[PDB]
Design a protein around this ligand. Structure first.
Ligand SMILES: C[C@@H]1N[C@H](CN)[C@@H](O)[C@H](O)[C@@H]1O
Ligand SMILES: C[C@@H]1N[C@H](CN)[C@@H](O)[C@H](O)[C@@H]1O
Ligand SMILES: C[C@@H]1N[C@H](CN)[C@@H](O)[C@H](O)[C@@H]1O
Ligand SMILES: C[C@@H]1N[C@H](CN)[C@@H](O)[C@H](O)[C@@H]1O
Lengths: 441, 441, 441, 441
């Protein structure tokens, strides 16, 4: 058994299934999906933090932006919904009338994802399950439905792993003042013993009702409640050894680390398992203001996934549904495009390990990423070279046999100085889709 | 911004407005005002503590006295209200039917006060505002009115600062046993995590609804809740830099210290800002048993204010209203008398600083106090000398010019040995009211 | 860079070299090696603990035993050396006259060990390096030599890893009373801040002088110094990322766990990296009283090694040299025997991983262990069966090819029900040494 | 009496003498003054921190730099003094052969400084007084003299205040590894209880032997000794109420805050007392590599002083003497230049307070700073305008009288819109030295 102390909990390491999964789907869905609006300012890590909360690109932070008067959100809300329409009132408009969880589960499976993590409770404190610790939840208001539960059944039916996102660090149902500057986060928090118990009780309830594969907390865990985690993590691991927790609790234990947009993104192999998360656009929650110009293209999603994976992480790509339970076409098309590349190149991604190095580039700048499966080394070009002669800078191979991944064709190569030169017939280059993939043995 | 740690909060010092205000009005008003009764035994610091709680002069401690059977209060209650009339039941008789907050605000302004602090919640735990954390409050019972709110508007309308008194340390809604000896205070306290959250939540709510100029806590802050103060004080100071807190929280920070009757009263300059508090009589809450013999006279209020001020403090003088919202004539007349002296001598009090020394006396025992305004030194006699020749013991002046404050008349003086001799024409002595005031430059 | 906090230090996991090494050599050597005497009572975990300290089989515990009057050690010592003969005096008799560090390293490399960990300081507080925090060390006393540094240089020149053992939890130079019962360990420890500093300073010193590959602490870390380990570990990992620490510090962090004789020995796959340690006999320090009846035979060492590796562990086999620095023949022969077995079967041990299960057994009781290297599964029998027909219980293989490891010869097999049947030609069974080994692909 | 608790110690505020003094002299002098060498890379706050320790402009950090092999210091040292030349050896070469404490004090009083604070012990752990806790001090080594005591006696005889600087947070006599990156500061510290005692004992010793006016700690206080400061501070204030402490202890209490070069420099009125410190050049310790290109000119010192004072701070200007105890001419000339300016404009600096605003500027870009003394407002231009017509932006005065400070001559002025227009006769503008100064009443 695991014991409730960090030294014992340290015995639990990231489960094998998570390490091999590589790709998961995040879902930021809640009453903020109804107004579904934000100023698409930029990417976290690139937007100056002196402005960020005033021009917040995260549509799920709508309530916080609403509280800052004369924030673009406040202007939009007053003209659209009125000055007398409290944020909470969106719970009545959040109906999920067109929601079909098996349809989501199928799209995620078709997209190539192996696990799904919905927001059970984001910062606004609204719970997407029939929690018994608050009436501000989807069973008592809005959908009159247990979204977390119904989605967990659908996802598991599709054979995917199901995890839960919980906002332990923030709950605007316990504060009145908005966050305007990063500094405010140091003191505008629930702060009470009451809140530390609520958060513990709610995650315990998520463990009891759905036994999730991942406990993905956000924004730290209330200080007064930190010692509780030893007990919660043991309780969880004893019911579900293959369960896993992220690194946003602020305590000694975690099974995998996280990076969000530019924030904490590794430049090379990090030495521990991690997971990169971002939305398809600049928001997590649905933003009606984003168009294709604010979103990654299929190509960029593939290069992204490849880079993350060659560095040992998983890609946790966020989908932001509308209040009605539908997934916007722009998102769906990107997911399906990724799923297509994965159906074709999945073997060089899933179940792979990192190699000695993650990266290389060709003489004319095409980036290259590596992954491994025992003796097999996959060479994944972020792009398809135009000519047949390829020169990879700073790489030698002692394999004696390099093949073209898709066809299996054995190819001609040789170590030329500090480089590796290979000839790939144009007929093969023409068969690859977004990436030229080679396999060295 | 202020950060939630004592080292950062230390940057906040007493606001300039508070330091210059000199005089404020305390208001102990609540359901204890209805029975409005106590044995006027004596002054805190003079009554032996082995008897104090059994013959409590603080009428606001009525409930605690009621719980000690065979306490004079218990005898009075049973004969007047009956053995079956619970203390809580007074909330139904507390109607404030004759209450006029603008009338109070005007009396306080006329009295010369610059800030007003009502009891939002005293030890009996009854809240004079529509708090959402208890139904034992003035909006749900008694007046069916938000007294703190309506009084805050009235006081601000009169141009005075508004602060709030909160009993963080005691709440008899969380205990059953009475305090009989000082020792009991060490353990008869709410004690729960629940109470530490309630107190934090209620002061946060007072900050949110009324943004007070002073947070005047009493009886210490619950131990389990002490770390919360770093967050509460930062939250408060960031919303209201010019806000201020007293020294009864039991934590590193405070903006000004307090003395109550004889307790902690400085004998000379203390080196930090402080505030002296007391009722006009021996109680804070209305005591129908006090007559003029238990109250300070206008003269004694003036000497009091002068002494406090010459030592760097403010006088926080308590008014105890009746259950109907009226202020007893004996109190009102003393307030107005003080206001009259202040209209005349205000310039030697308001906005002043301490001098090198606070005190001196005349050859025949008249006490003298000093205050300052840059180069101007005010010499305030606690009384009006009979003869024209005045000899101040142990004082020399290097001003070359001493005037009679009221008229401006230049007077004749000279340093005679270790003394200062001055001649004040009887026509001038006859114009002064309760104090001879001289001005040296 | 690792930061000095548990959450950050958790980013460091057991290094690859340690995971792949499988076999290392422990060396308990010090002044207790001079008397080299204990009553070989039995194995830790089997001998009742109410008798253990009184008849301690760990010869390195001689001083503690000596402190227990009329314990077999007391009597032996008084009869051999006399009552006017303090334990410390052995420091002067510890001359290591015949020590040859390169011979030790040649021997351990021949035995098949990939790392060596000598006792730099055992419970008696005698230090084997020229420490500057105590004069009770090998440079000042006895050998007049830096034993730790000289062995480190030889071990590393032989191509092996070098770690250090340090008794952080016990130091008899700071106590006077012996440990008589397990409970005594809870209060009879140095206990002072002075000792906490000393232990911190000496491990830091080992790190700065030798930068070891393993920091092997024993008996917990002084409670007063536990917070220091956050800094010590970050400082160490920042200078040597491939460095490692065991799990006897009593803090949140460790890279691998440990089991001693029967204590904490896993019966199955534990799920984290660990290391098994024990003496070739029943003691760690040299014991002239042990005969071959008290030691493991080469066959049992092989079986011990295999069991350990199949379960994900490393064997840290202890060698106990004499005071003159020679390794007793009984131990050298067993080391060589194991080295020989490893020279034949090494490929199925070094660099392997655990399989789905660690263990099986034939229909006739022969135990089997499994190890893995990608698609290759090693089937290691703990013995060599007599008949060519072998029936393994409760096992089915989906390999389609099962070879005899040493010869590489393809073997006939089929899954018969819930069993696996293999025919091993007598010629092949005769080729194997202590273990029949098969390889499935 | 102050009690040893933060709430009580908070009763002590910055003393009047320190608030009124405005200008003091810092002295970084020790054995590092002998090599007196650094690469004058730039100012702290501008030089990237990933290069700063490798090209440290603080010559007093010589030992740390020397510990970084092939850092410009390492190379310089090996070429000048050799590889067989330990840093400690400079202690013997530090002879202060030409030191004359009264000459130093005469110089600082001429410069206009009101207090002097020498380094009693910098990061290298060398002590400049006959401490009894270490032999690595000036009485036993090099000068054979109590530098701290002798300078204290001379400074005080010159009529100035005397404080002491102590490196509580760093002492390289307890570490071996150099600081290479800012992060290293989080774990490379003495860390022991022994060090916490030593630091406590030495500051106590400074207090008992010299009763300094300022306790200037640097680099935080050892975590294990932070609770000791409650006692140290009470003990100190009880012996010397006018004593003071800076804000580099990392505990709740401090009397004034600090800013170093660009680090923590306020752009406006901070609201608490503070002190700015920096070298005349880019180093604190003497650096023979600095020329006048690396130093502030007399004009910039004046401007620095004014900016600081207008914002409520004091300037603690650092002087870096040579190993022989003489102050380099480049520094002595700038000290004298500033002293001259202070002899003319002192009345607008010493004893002043901040005004409503610290700053303004003319229509043509000349910066202006304000200071106050009761009803007098000093308008200090950072330069001397060329034209007699001066237009100050965004300022209106209700004084009715504006004089030219040096001559006292009444000037013509009027508020023109949102500006202030003054005519300063060319004769007067020519009388001023580095700053045009006006006085409004
Ligand atoms: C995955 C993202 N995490 C951030 C907190 N860093 C959230 O604020 C954001 O809304 C989203 O949930
Ligand atoms: C101002 C006074 N403070 C005391 C606590 N010392 C209270 O017990 C009393 O009722 C009144 O509120
Ligand atoms: C490896 C062994 N560890 C035990 C501590 N349980 C020691 O008591 C013993 O001396 C030996 O060092
Ligand atoms: C005044 C300056 N303080 C810094 C510490 N930040 C020191 O590193 C430097 O040597 C000098 O003493």
């Amino acid at each position: 058994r695991y014991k409730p102390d960090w030294e014992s909990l340290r015995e639990h390491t990231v489960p094998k299934w998570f390490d091999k999964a590589k790709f998961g789907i995040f879902i930021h869905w809640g009453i903020y999906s109804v107004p579904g609006w934000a100023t698409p300012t930029g990417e976290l890590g690139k937007v100056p933090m002196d402005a960020w909360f005033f021009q917040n690109p995260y549509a799920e932070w709508y309530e916080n932006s609403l509280r800052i008067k004369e924030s673009p959100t406040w202007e939009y809300h007053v003209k659209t919904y009125g000055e007398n329409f409290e944020y909470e009132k969106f719970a009545d408009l959040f109906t999920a009338e067109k929601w079909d969880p098996q349809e989501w589960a199928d799209l995620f499976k078709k997209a190539g994802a192996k696990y799904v993590i919905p927001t059970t409770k984001h910062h606004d404190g609204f719970c997407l399950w029939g929690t018994k610790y608050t009436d501000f939840n989807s069973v008592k208001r809005g959908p009159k439905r247990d979204l977390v539960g119904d989605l967990a059944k659908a996802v598991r039916e599709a054979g995917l792993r199901f995890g839960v996102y919980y906002s332990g660090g923030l709950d605007w149902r316990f504060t009145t003042e908005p966050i305007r500057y990063p500094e405010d986060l140091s003191y505008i928090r629930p702060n009470t013993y009451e809140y530390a118990d609520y958060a513990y009780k709610q995650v315990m309830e998520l463990v009891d009702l759905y036994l999730p594969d991942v406990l993905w907390n956000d924004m730290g865990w209330p200080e007064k409640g930190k010692e509780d985690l030893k007990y919660l993590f043991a309780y969880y691991y004893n019911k579900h050894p293959e369960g896993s927790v992220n690194d946003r609790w602020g305590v000694p234990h975690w099974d995998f680390k996280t990076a969000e947009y530019h924030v904490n993104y590794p430049g090379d192999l990090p030495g521990y398992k991690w997971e990169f998360t971002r939305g398809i656009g600049l928001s997590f929650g649905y933003n009606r203001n984003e168009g294709p110009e604010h979103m990654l293209s299929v190509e960029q999603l593939v290069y992204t996934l490849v880079d993350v994976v060659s560095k040992g992480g998983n890609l946790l790509l966020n989908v932001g549904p509308k209040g009605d339970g539908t997934i916007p076409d722009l998102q769906k098309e990107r997911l399906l495009g990724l799923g297509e590349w994965l159906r074709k190149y999945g073997d060089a991604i899933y179940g792979t390990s990192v190699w000695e190095r993650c990266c290389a580039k060709t003489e004319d700048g095409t980036e290259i990423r590596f992954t491994r499966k025992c003796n097999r080394i996959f060479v994944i070009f972020l792009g398809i070279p135009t000519g047949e002669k390829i020169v990879i800078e700073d790489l030698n191979l002692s394999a004696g046999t390099v093949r073209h991944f898709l066809t299996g064709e054995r190819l001609s190569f040789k170590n030329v100085g500090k480089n590796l030169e290979i000839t790939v017939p144009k007929k093969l280059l023409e068969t690859d889709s977004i990436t030229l993939v080679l396999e060295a043995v």
